[PDB]
């Protein structure tokens, strides 16, 4: 029998079993049962001295055990490394055992099952029937999972089943509660193994009058009284609440491969099962493949809120406890933990995901054709937008032009949609497709047939949005690759962190290396320090800035430094400069750079002044070989990607390289975590020290280099930073650049893995060619060994404000003098979420003007400062005097710690002051914005409106009368300080602030 893996899961009954779901060529699902065993590793003497015989004993050949404990030495007399050689054995135990002197206990038992049996988690195999125990139809048992999975076959395509569902309940003044608010609409999208994609929406028939139900039936809506009358081939079906809930219960109990929702565990499934229990007393029941276990619908909470840094904490994830093998996937949590976005909402994600350029064809009043053929954009986006539009009715023209679809058409590699949009001057507009925007409360206030149909369309669009996001993100292939690489079940790919992930490949590597690492001593708490994080040299650079990026800097630092726990000879510490100099001389004369490396790290204890770690970078360790293997695997998959034709293979290779990149880019943070598998404090400190040394060397060699008469004159000599080699030191080198090219380029920026170096030239293609030549020469002359550097891009007008805060215009390797608009902001107000939209727009406009104002040359700092001061004075005076009539001036936004439960650092009684004064208020809470105002008078002293009327916490109202002014905040002095940072005048402009108005009145109050 030939099968392909789909998912692995375990039962929580008395007899633990491992369940494998597999698919055949013809589409028949197969379930296989394996015994759940506990794996232990023992030595020869330990194995031969076990009074209770093990259930099953498997040899492990020969190994070598090494202790990796840290020893602090105050002199050069340091002992050797602990090492032992003994044949090993592997033990399988059906029940939990407490074996003393048992090592390799950190690895999971499922990983042991995968690796000892030599089974890939998602591999496609051709099994054997010699060990087949037919439990029931479609469920077998394998008692020897080593000869059954003895043959493998290349991948073949298999069908899969998907269910995407959404619900809509009754709304009122308060939040919808399961006790009083009934379910109104339920939309479903169902795809079986036959490829049939069916969409259907059920509507609560008891919420409308009988004549309305009759009219809907006449319109073409099927009315049912029981589940047996339900038809899945009709989009609109009317049913009672009990029938709808039982239909949902029947649908959720099917053996789907994937049940995908968006925030469905917290709200959708919870509300559905609560209503099913509340109205009929029934419970949704799942059953194991072998029909043994039966479980109810349990939504449990996993909480992991800890970063071990300076940032915030994560939230709680809701999960569904089912043993049928169906993966209940929530897109909200996966997007939150795998993607970075300003707002984590379905509407925002849909708008930021589905977008394409459409050309206007008609301007007949509010009837605009928006043809989206492949000519107006790249290849692929047109098809995606058309597919998303096939089940939608609201389009966001440009950025904020909300329009309702009147008619749609689908053509080859394009789409035709007409919207109620005003006449536009341009021809091509970026249409972004998002969630429909309707007033649900107002619609519920006048519930009828038309509003019911509108809510049905909204619900079906919400249900299909999950499928659209799932297809866009390539979640299925990503899950397959994660299972294949992490040595984890397909359902466990997104359920853990990097510490859990790294256990698999390391366990696989250890057997190949024939090595065991043992750590005994307890670990303390004490910092490491390190890194360079170069500050900007100047505060203004309108010249082109080329970008040089290291290729996997930290893995190469570890492979060159051999910073493995078993390779560290030792660390020497010193407290006085005399003994420090003695130790320095002894280490210079004892361990030489030709054979060793001596990394001058930071002392752990305060009394120490000298901290020197020594690494014998001659042998190959576990972390070094792991990193080398990961880099080689990613390179191989990258070379296989573009050398292929099939799109499925393209997606598979892209996902594989993505997973390899993720697993390779976590080792450095792994070593620094105390509760990890490769915690090496000295190795991590040496890694960051060598990284900062390499960054120092590259920054120094290019901090002021010049190109005269086609000769490259480096700023400093080609001095080898730490080790000794046979390399030249002459900075002046021959170039292939044209002789007439005369430029002086200096390095400005770079923190941990890249260097931004400005070049005084203002040309684009000329700068690109110069950067390419510089990169080639640096890879040939400046750098050494594996530390290679690639030219990334050119950053025009790269202007700084502070550390990790710069704005520029990005180019590409093929960018010409007419490059497409592309800007890069890092740490500035444009990218920060706590900055108003008006502030971001003003900053962007000012920087775009500066990009040419500073490029003028003759316009010195004085003229630029005068122009900026005039513009700011005019704008501020106009805003202060004339004022803007409508709202949406600043609208300061924040993460989910303000305006949900009071605000950040809650003001206690201030919220309760609104209570007992307005008893008709509703329990508040959301993540929208934040604001604070001053109800004072005397415009010179911030005369604004009272808090109560409208400038309170951000909410919505119906109508209002008198008003005084809009809130003013720190944004003015914030942009003034940003301008001061940009401008070279600085201090003088700093005075201008308090010269302008210089008013700092009281805040808060009432």
């Amino acid at each position: 029998m030939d099968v392909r893996c789909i998912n692995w899961f375990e039962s929580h009954g008395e007899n633990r079993f491992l369940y494998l779901k597999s698919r055949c060529r013809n589409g028949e699902t197969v379930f296989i049962r394996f015994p759940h065993y506990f794996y232990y590793v023992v030595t020869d003497e330990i194995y031969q001295s076990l009074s209770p015989p093990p259930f099953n004993a498997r040899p492990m050949g020969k190994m070598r055990t090494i202790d990796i404990d840290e020893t602090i030495s105050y002199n050069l007399d340091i002992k050797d490394r602990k090492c032992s050689v003994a044949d090993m054995w592997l033990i399988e135990e059906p029940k939990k055992r407490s074996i003393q002197n048992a090592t390799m206990d950190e690895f999971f038992n499922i990983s042991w099952f995968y690796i000892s049996n030599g089974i890939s988690p998602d591999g496609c195999y051709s099994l054997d029937e010699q060990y087949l125990t037919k439990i029931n139809n479609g469920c077998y048992h394998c008692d020897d999972p080593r000869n059954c999975f003895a043959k493998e076959i290349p991948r073949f395509d298999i069908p899969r089943s998907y269910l995407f569902l959404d619900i809509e309940c009754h709304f009122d003044k308060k939040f919808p509660s399961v006790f009083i608010n009934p379910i109104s609409h339920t939309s479903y999208c169902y795809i079986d193994l036959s490829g049939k994609r069916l969409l259907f929406t059920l509507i609560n028939e008891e919420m409308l009058t009988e004549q309305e139900i009759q009219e809907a039936v006449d319109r073409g809506c099927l009315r049912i009284q029981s589940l047996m009358e339900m038809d899945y081939e009709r989009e609109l079906v009317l049913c009672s609440e009990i029938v709808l809930l039982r239909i949902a219960k029947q649908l959720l109990e099917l053996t789907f491969d994937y049940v995908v929702t968006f925030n469905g565990h917290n709200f959708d499934l919870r509300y559905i099962t609560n209503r099913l229990e509340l109205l009929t007393g029934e419970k949704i029941i799942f059953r194991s493949p072998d029909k043994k276990e039966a479980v109810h619908l349990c939504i449990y909470e996993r909480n992991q809120s800890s970063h071990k840094g300076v940032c915030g904490m994560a939230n709680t994830t809701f999960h569904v406890n089912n043993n049928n093998g169906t993966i209940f996937f929530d897109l909200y949590s996966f997007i939150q933990k795998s993607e970075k976005l300003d707002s984590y909402k379905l509407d925002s994600i849909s708008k930021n995901a589905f977008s394409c350029m459409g050309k206007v064809l008609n301007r007949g009043v509010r009837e605009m054709t928006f043809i989206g053929d492949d000519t107006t954009d790249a290849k692929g986006k047109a098809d995606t937008f058309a597919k998303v539009l096939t089940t939608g009715n609201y389009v966001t023209v440009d950025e904020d032009i909300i329009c309702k679809v009147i008619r749609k058409d689908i053509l080859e590699n394009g789409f035709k949609v007409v919207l109620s949009c005003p006449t536009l001057p341009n021809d091509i507009y970026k249409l972004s497709f998002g969630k429909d925007d309707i007033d649900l409360a107002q619609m519920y206030k006048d519930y009828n047939l038309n509003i019911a149909l509108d809510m049905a369309r909204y619900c079906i669009h919400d249900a299909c949005l999950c499928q659209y996001l799932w297809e866009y993100y390539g979640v299925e292939t990503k899950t397959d690759a994660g299972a294949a690489t992490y040595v984890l079940p397909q359902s466990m790919v997104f359920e853990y962190r990097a510490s859990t992930i790294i256990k698999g490949p390391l366990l696989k590597l250890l057997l190949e290396t024939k090595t065991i690492l043992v750590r005994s001593e307890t670990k303390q708490k004490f910092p490491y320090e390190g890194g360079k994080v170069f500050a900007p040299k100047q505060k203004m650079f309108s010249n082109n800035v080329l970008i040089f990026d290291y290729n996997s800097l930290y893995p190469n630092v570890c492979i060159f430094g051999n910073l493995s726990p078993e390779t560290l000879v030792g660390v020497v510490v010193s407290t006085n400069r005399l003994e420090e100099e003695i130790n320095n001389q002894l280490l210079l004369q004892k361990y030489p750079p030709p054979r060793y490396i001596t990394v001058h790290c930071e002392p752990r204890l305060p009394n120490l002044i000298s901290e020197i770690a020594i690494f014998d970078r001659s042998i190959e360790g576990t972390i070094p070989r792991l990193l080398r293997t990961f880099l080689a695997e990613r390179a191989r998959y990258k070379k296989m990607l573009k050398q292929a034709t099939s799109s499925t293979e393209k997606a598979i290779y892209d996902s594989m390289q993505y997973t390899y990149k993720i697993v390779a880019n976590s080792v450095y943070g792994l070593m620094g975590f105390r509760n990890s598998a490769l915690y090496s404090y000295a190795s991590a400190k040496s890694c960051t020290s060598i990284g900062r040394r390499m960054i120092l060397y590259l920054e120094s060699v290019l901090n002021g280099a010049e190109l005269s008469n086609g000769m490259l004159r480096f700023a400093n000599t080609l001095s080898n930073p730490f080790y000794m080699d046979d390399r030249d030191i002459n900075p002046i080198v021959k170039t292939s650049l044209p002789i007439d090219y005369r430029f002086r380029f200096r390095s400005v920026y770079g923190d941990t893995d890249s260097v931004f170096t400005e070049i005084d030239s203002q040309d684009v293609d000329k700068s690109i060619e110069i950067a390419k030549e510089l990169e080639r020469l640096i890879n040939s002359r400046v750098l050494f060994n594996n530390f290679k550097i690639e030219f990334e891009a050119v950053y025009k007008n790269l202007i700084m404000q502070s550390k990790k805060k710069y704005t520029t215009m990005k180019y590409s390797a093929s960018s010409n003098s007419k490059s497409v608009p592309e800007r890069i902001n890092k740490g500035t107000s444009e990218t920060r979420r706590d900055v108003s939209k008006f502030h971001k727009n003003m900053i962007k406009t000012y920087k775009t003007r500066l990009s040419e104002m500073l490029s003028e040359g003759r316009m010195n700092s004085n003229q630029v400062c005068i122009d900026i001061l005039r513009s700011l004075e005019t704008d501020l005076r106009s805003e202060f005097d004339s004022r803007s009539s409508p709202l949406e001036l600043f609208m300061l936004s924040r993460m989910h710690h303000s305006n949900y439960k009071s605000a950040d650092n809650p003001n206690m009684y201030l919220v309760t002051e609104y209570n007992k004064n307005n008893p008709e208020t509703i329990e508040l809470g959301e993540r929208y914005y934040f604001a604070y105002i001053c109800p004072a008078n005397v415009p010179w002293t911030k005369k604004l409106v009272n808090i109560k009327t409208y400038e309170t916490i951000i909410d919505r109202s119906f109508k209002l009368g008198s008003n005084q002014r809009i809130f003013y905040e720190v944004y003015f002095k914030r942009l003034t300080s940003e301008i001061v940072n940009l401008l070279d005048n600085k201090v003088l402009c700093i005075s201008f602030f308090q010269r302008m108005f210089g008013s700092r009145p009281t805040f808060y109050e009432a």
Binding site: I180, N274, E301, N303, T316
Partner: protein, 218 residues
């Protein structure tokens, strides 16, 4: 010690002044899910739902909170058995005897212990079915626990898995003691000799330790 006349038929509300700030809010909750839990007969009678409200929270030092009332012969007072045949009360009495050294417990009531209040997480349950009305008290259970922890120094909970994620349900920072269940917290009997922990914790907070002897009735 005031009282309120809600829109249903409980009679034993009789709430003390300490519950005054929140009692009215509790009424709002009882205006939401009263009928859903009142449809089925409960182990406590409706005239015994809120018996644990006459006890003042001022001079109280230790809180003992159970999971739910007994499925049969519900009296409205936690750990109150007129027959002394229930497993929980008998196990508690045996533990007290083993940790103190007092024998022949003819009677043992936890309502007369100075400093210890008998409490239950869920205020009522259906006849025969333990914590059947679970989702109908979740807001009320959280409100009562939050009100209690702000007046007591220690919290001795009952059951492990039932009170597993009690830290999330208790946003108020209070020193909570992880206590097991007498019969079986997780399908296994435990003894949990930790009363001296409560005694020394009370000694730390400048108050007298609990004398686990005033509850015996002779």
């Amino acid at each position: 010690m005031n009282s309120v006349t809600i829109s249903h038929a409980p009679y034993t509300i009789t709430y003390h002044d300490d519950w005054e700030p929140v009692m009215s809010q509790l009424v709002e909750f009882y205006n939401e899910v009263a009928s859903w839990l009142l449809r089925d007969e409960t182990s406590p009678i409706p005239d015994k739902f809120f018996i644990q409200l006459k006890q003042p929270l001022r001079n109280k030092r230790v809180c003992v909170c159970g999971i739910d009332p007994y499925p049969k012969d519900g009296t409205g007072v936690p750990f109150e058995s007129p027959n002394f045949t229930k497993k929980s009360i008998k196990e508690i009495a045996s533990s007290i005897s083993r940790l103190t050294g007092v024998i022949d417990y003819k009677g043992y009531n936890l309502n007369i212990i100075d400093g210890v209040i008998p409490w239950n997480y869920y205020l009522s349950c259906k006849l025969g079915e333990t914590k059947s009305h679970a989702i109908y008290w979740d807001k009320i259970s959280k409100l009562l626990l939050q009100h209690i922890t702000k007046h007591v120094s220690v919290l001795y909970c009952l059951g492990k898995t039932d009170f597993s994620n009690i830290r999330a349900k208790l946003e108020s920072p209070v020193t909570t003691i992880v206590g097991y269940h007498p019969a079986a917290r997780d399908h296994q009997f435990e003894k949990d000799r930790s009363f001296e922990i409560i005694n020394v914790l009370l000694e730390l907070d400048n108050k007298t330790p609990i004398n686990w002897a005033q509850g015996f009735i002779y």
